[PDB]
Structure 1
Amino acid sequence: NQEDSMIMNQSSIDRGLFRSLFFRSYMDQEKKYGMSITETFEKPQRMKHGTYDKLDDDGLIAPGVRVSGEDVIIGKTTKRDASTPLRSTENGIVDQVLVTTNQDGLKFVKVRVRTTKIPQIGDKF
């Protein structure tokens, strides 16, 4: 606890003390391109260097699915890829996926990924 840092009771953390929830909200949409040619969400056949497998064939991950590193939480096509990989720095659990359309009618996607943060040696209080 020296120099204005502190000692945390791990027993009390295990019992839940200062356990945080965390959320992230990746977004993407099907872009419209002049001659009505538009993008599309889907598992493709260029590709990103991460694990597409956790995707579905609608280019999405369904909630309640663990995810790590550069996994794909959103597959898209402009073959010609525009898939959205997970934050290279987070290891979460998919929470809730949303699909609606724009004021242009574009297929609009928002993935939410959930993690519980746990008071670690180095955390600020």
Structure 2
Amino acid sequence: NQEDSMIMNQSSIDRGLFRSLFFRSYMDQEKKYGMSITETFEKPQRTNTLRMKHGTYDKLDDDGLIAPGVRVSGEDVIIGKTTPISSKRDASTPLRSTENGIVDQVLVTTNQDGLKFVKVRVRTTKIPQIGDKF
């Protein structure tokens, strides 16, 4: 407990003491180009480009997003997106390299210009651990 640092009874830590929730939330849109060329929310794989990510796309559905229940972790993908360039370059968005948790709520909406808009929210639970500040 010496010099500004305490001893916290673990037992109570377990009984729920100081447990916190933590929600983050990525977001992407289907950029458009007046000369008709649109990005898209699909689950690609090889097919010319090769330019993808190391992450495991296998957690995505077919619309390019993940669904609640899922349990994301390392650099897994969270959003599938492709840009037609002159044709498979990724624009998908991985879960922040250092985090990990459970998706919690997603949502697709339209963005004025009639673009597809998504907002993925991955929730995690953090428990009073040693390095933690109080």
Give your verdict on TM over 0.5.
Answer: yes
Deviation at 1:37, TM superposition (A): 1.2
Alpha-carbon displacement from aligned partner over 1:52-79 (angstroms, at most 9, x marks no partner) = 1001111110111101110000010011
Residue 40 (structure 2) pairs with residue 31 (structure 1)? no
Deviation of 1:25 after TM superposition, in Å, equals: 0.6
TM-score by length of 1: 0.97
- Secondary structure of residue in 1 paired with 2:108: strand
- Alignment match, 2:42: 42
Aligned-partner Cα distance in 2 for 1:105–1:3: 58
**Aligned residues between the structures:** 125
Give TM-score, length-normalised by structure 2: 0.91
C-alpha distance in 1 between matches for 2:58 and 2:52: 12
Shift of 1:103: 1.4
User: Alpha-carbon deviation of 1:116?
Assistant: 0.6
Deviation at 1:34, TM superposition (A): 1.8
User: Using the alignment, how far apart are the partners of 1:80 and 1:13 within structure 2?
Assistant: 46
Give me the whole-angstrom Cα distance separating, in 2, the residues matched to 1:104 and 1:3. Answer: 57
More strand by share: 1
Cα distance in 1 for residues equivalent to 2:125 and 2:95: 17
Question: CA separation in 2, counterparts of 1:48 and 1:57?
Answer: 17
What CA deviation, in whole Å up to 9, does each residue of 1:91-122 have, x standing for no partner?
11000001001111110010000101100001
How far residue 8 of structure 1 moved from its aligned partner, in angstroms, is 0.6
SS of aligned partner of 1:13: helix
- Match of 2:107, SS state, is strand
Distance in 1 of aligned mates of 2:90 and 2:34 = 19
Distance 1:124 1:64 in 2: 30
CA distance in 2, matches of 1:105, 1:57: 21
The answer as to 2:123 corresponding to 1:118 is no
**Cα shift at 1:36:** 2.0
Q: Which runs of 5+ in 2 are unaligned?
A: 46-50
Q: Distance in 1 between matches of 2:118 and 2:44?
A: 17
RMSD: 0.7
Runs of 4+ in 1 over 4 A off after TM superposition: none
Q: Find the aligned partners of 1:83 and 1:61 in 2 and give their Cα distance.
A: 12
Secondary structure class of the residue paired with 2:3: coil
Distance 2:107 2:90 in 1: 21
Identity of aligned residues (%): 100
